[PDB]
Design a protein around this ligand. Structure first.
Ligand SMILES: Nc1nc(-c2ccc(Cc3ccccc3)cc2)c[se]1
Ligand SMILES: [Yb+3]
Ligand SMILES: [Yb+3]
Ligand SMILES: [Yb+3]
Ligand SMILES: [Zn+2]
Length: 607
């Protein structure tokens, strides 16, 4: 059972198909139209069913050409309101009907951000984008909002004719809107069954550039050239991912570069990966995010978590594939470097939450938890750490990659639990069950804190980062003039980032050390979002008042939660910036992504 959904479960009925016909009204900030659900009964004598909704206005429900009775339940906080629908005729098992629901969204839909022209690159046209993961699809349309149900979809979206709509689907044509010659209808088809959290919509002044045989990049015109260069490795990464996972089944692999308020690094919407413009470093150094989103085309989008309690299956296996793509491109020492960095991120999460915190468990119970509040790097890194540990236990990456490809083939088009994964692991590795029974499964899956065993990591690329970090931490005032711009000459951007991450783990440093770092390394000049984020955190935690305007600016000019949340929390914890942090949040709140706004508010204890 999915405790995050109020809808009828998959054991009662299953949505097979959605046909969405809607109009994007920028004056009212509403999506209006019809969701036609093809629903299959899984039981005899089915006479009603329940859908998820959140802040939706329901005009009517039509089955077999007549209006039918429906009722909205009391709202259950972040889960929304259940919508019970009375069927005109009882269904037998496996019988299908089409339920056509006329609805409108709220301007406050947690799924959507509406941008004014002033909030866009071009400043002439407004912009809309969605983000449904985990349980925001119910804030766009009525649905069984649970990843335990997979459906195909078709859509027709009416927008102002000057704008472009795109969806997590194959583009299926465009025509003038016959109801309104000021509007255009864009059509879409998703023929591969997906969980509804993968439904996505953007509407804006978008342009495209081809960057590979199956890849267009989409953005406002101002970002197209930079994006095309940044993500030029995409086709090479797809070919490697196909080698690891089997055939890419989705047709197109397009990229959309969102406005800076996009809350995540990326979102694996099928046929149209959404990415943060904070990837645009100018040197392709943040392209692991593209490898991650590509890998989701197998782990997450083909094999799906049955409930959000099992989200680690999606992210652990995806980080595992991501790091294999980066390892095939840049070498095994690089794969180990990234793996060991992820262990450090896991150490940070466990230290921040506390070692008994339930959000440090690999399998969680989200019954009365807002999934957006639970979100962290734990399922990513504790998930990856379990798979990397099993890789080493079971005979190395070639052997474990055989398991991963077999796993994707076994569970393609299905939704699974941790127990399904573990049973298949045991079946695949039948000749190594003795080894598998050495694993402390209870600790790994269900205990808080750091995992009970740390994998073995190659140190080759990490050594220079630790050595420089240790020189600065152990430095006294009389050692500061020994540091020089030459300290960095043999370090990649990745190694610079890891130097800063190592150093930030020991923050604060003395203010004179941080000022000297700026004097010799000029980190204030670096635009790479990952490096700048860690540098500004180091400066604020080390109480450098000169960094306050830089950190406020980075926290507000983009909205990737990875950066915005810790920067706000650091500025709130520094007495010199505390009031500015709160005031800046209050001033920007109305312009922010609704989920980011909610979480920054909770972080700052500002209601
Ligand atoms: N620690 C652990 N946390 C999880 C965990 C954390 C968040 C979610 C919900 C979610 C997913 C994606 C985007 C937004 C919200 C589910 C599971 C598993 Se183990
Ligand atoms: Yb019957
Ligand atoms: Yb077509
Ligand atoms: Yb078994
Ligand atoms: Zn992911």
């Amino acid at each position: 059972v999915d405790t995050c959904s109020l809808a009828s479960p998959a054991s009662v009925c299953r949505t097979k198909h959605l046909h969405l016909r809607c109009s994007v009204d920028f004056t009212r900030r509403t999506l209006t139209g019809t969701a036609a659900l093809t629903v299959q009964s899984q039981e005899d004598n089915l006479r009603s069913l329940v859908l998820d909704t959140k802040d939706l206005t329901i005009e009517k429900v039509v089955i077999n050409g007549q209006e039918v009775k429906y009722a909205l339940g009391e709202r259950q906080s972040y889960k929304g309101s259940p919508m019970e629908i009375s069927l005109p005729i009882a269904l037998s098992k496996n019988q299908e009907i089409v339920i056509e629901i006329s609805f409108e969204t709220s301007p406050k839909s947690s799924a959507l951000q509406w941008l004014t022209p002033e909030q866009t690159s071009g400043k002439e046209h407004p912009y809309l984008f969605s983000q449904c993961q985990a349980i925001h699809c119910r804030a766009i349309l009525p649905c069984q909002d649970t990843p335990s149900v997979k459906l195909t979809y078709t859509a027709e979206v009416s927008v102002p004719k000057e704008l472009v709509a795109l969806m997590s689907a194959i583009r299926d044509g465009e025509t003038p809107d016959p109801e309104d010659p000021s509007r255009k209808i864009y059509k879409f088809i998703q023929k591969v069954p997906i969980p509804c959290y993968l439904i996505a919509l953007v509407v804006g002044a978008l342009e495209s550039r081809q960057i590979g045989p199956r890849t267009l990049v989409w953005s406002e015109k101002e970002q197209v050239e930079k994006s095309a260069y940044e993500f030029s490795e995409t086709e090479s990464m797809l070919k490697i991912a196909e080698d690891l996972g089997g055939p890419y089944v989705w047709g197109q692999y397009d990229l959309l570069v969102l406005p800076p308020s996009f809350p995540y690094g990326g979102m694996e919407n099928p046929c149209l990966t959404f990415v943060t413009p904070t990837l645009l470093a100018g040197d392709k150094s943040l392209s692991n995010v593209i490898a991650h989103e590509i890998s989701h085309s197998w782990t997450g989008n083909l094999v799906t978590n049955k409930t959000w309690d099992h989200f680690w299956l999606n992210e652990g296996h995806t980080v595992y594939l991501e790091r294999h793509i980066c390892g095939r491109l840049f070498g095994e020492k690089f794969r180990h470097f990234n793996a060991l960095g992820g262990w450090g991120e896991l150490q940070n999460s466990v230290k921040t939450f506390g070692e008994t915190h339930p959000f440090t468990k690999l399998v969680v119970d989200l019954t009365d938890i807002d999934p957006d509040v639970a979100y962290s790097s734990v399922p990513y890194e504790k998930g990856f750490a379990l798979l990397f540990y099993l890789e080493q236990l079971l005979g190395g990456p070639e052997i474990f990659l055989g398991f991963l490809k077999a796993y994707v083939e076994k569970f393609s088009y299905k939704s699974i639990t941790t127990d399904d994964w573990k049973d298949f692991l045991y079946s695949y590795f039948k000749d190594k069950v003795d080894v598998l029974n050495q694993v402390d499964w209870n600790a790994w899956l269900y205990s808080p804190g750091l995992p009970p065993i740390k994998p073995n990591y190659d140190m080759t690329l990490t050594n220079a980062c630790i050595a420089l970090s240790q020189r600065w931490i152990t430095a006294k005032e009389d050692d500061l003039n020994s540091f020089n711009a030459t300290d960095l000459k043999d370090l990649s951007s990745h190694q610079l980032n890891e130097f800063l991450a190592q150093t930030l783990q020991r923050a604060p440093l003395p203010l004179g050390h941080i000022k000297r770092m700026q004097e010799v390394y000029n980190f204030n000049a670096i635009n790479n979002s990952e490096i700048r984020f860690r540098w500004l955190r180091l400066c604020i935690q080390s109480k450098w008042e000169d960094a306050i305007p830089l950190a406020l600016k980075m926290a507000t000019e983009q909205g990737r939660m990875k950066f915005t949340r810790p920067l706000f929390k650091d500025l709130a914890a520094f007495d010199k910036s505390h009031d500015q942090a709160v005031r800046t949040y209050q001033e920007h709140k109305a312009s922010m992504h609704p989920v980011t706004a909610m979480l920054v508010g909770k972080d700052l204890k500002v209601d």
